[PDB]
Swiss-Prot record, chains A, B:
Hydrolyzes fluoroacetyl-CoA before it can react with citrate synthase, and thus confers fluoroacetate resistance. Cannot use acetyl-CoA as substrate. Substrate binds at F36, A37, T38, G39, F40, M41, V42, G43, L44, M45, E46, G65, R116. It comes from Streptantibioticus cattleyicolor (Streptomyces cattleya). Changing L22A: Reduced activity. Coiled coil: none annotated. This is Fluoroacetyl-CoA thioesterase. CoA binds at G65, H72, T73. One of its GO terms (molecular function) is protein homodimerization activity. Changing H72A: Reduced activity. The active site is at T38, E46, H72. Homodimer. The gene is flK. The keyword Transport does not apply.
Length: 133, 133
């Protein structure tokens, strides 16, 4: 896991990763064309980076996404394979950053950056509990 | 539309908007803390801007998100209300650019920018259906 190393992750888009499935609560999204939602592309890019960094975590640790800055440049219907490529840009202590890019086999669909922070899972969950109603 | 006009969108986070629910097929995400996923925060920011834009589109139009560039700085358990504030920066042809931020009643959880493109829904759906395997 050196800076400049590339990690790849492939995912066939199923029908339930389209826009209306991200927020079934949204009448505003209900009838939208059946294309892979930006929020699901983001979650796939983050999933690629989590798989790339798993060797860096010590027992008890996990990670949070702290920033996402990407374009979404072409649309993908269900059935195509989205390949995400995660290129490690920086690792320093708790902070990691990648350049991410995604292609659906037909078009480049988007690219940009993603940053993560390593967390201590138990300490983090206790903080979460204190702001839980 | 009025540049500098702020729109607010409030959303109580239900249990099914945590990280594990974004990708039930990800074993990695299945063990994550039960906090609002960045992919769901991105979709909520899109939803805010879609509601702001709606009165101003013509019949048969909608929009797509073309870029998002946000931080995600604090974590939110189910049961808090996330309020997205969306402020229009510019309208150029079919392109609309926004400043977005979100807060969960306890902490600011993220901020940055978002761009959208107005589409003709039927024309775009027919073009989508043609790259479908």
């Amino acid at each position: 896991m050196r800076v400049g190393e590339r990690f790849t992750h492939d995912f066939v888009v199923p029908p339930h990763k389209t826009v209306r499935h991200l927020y079934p609560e949204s009448p505003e999204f209900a009838e939208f064309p059946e294309v892979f939602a930006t929020g699901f592309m983001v979650g796939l890019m983050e999933w690629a980076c989590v798989r790339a960094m798993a060797p860096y975590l010590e027992p008890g640790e996990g990670s949070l996404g702290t920033a996402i800055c990407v374009t979404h440049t072409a649309a993908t219907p269900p059935g195509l394979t989205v390949t995400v490529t995660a290129e490690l840009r920086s690792v320093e202590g708790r902070r990691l950053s990648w350049r991410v890019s995604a292609h659906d086999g037909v078009d480049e669909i988007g690219s940009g950056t993603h940053e993560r922070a390593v967390i201590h899972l138990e300490k983090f969950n206790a903080k979460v509990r204190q702001k839980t109603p």
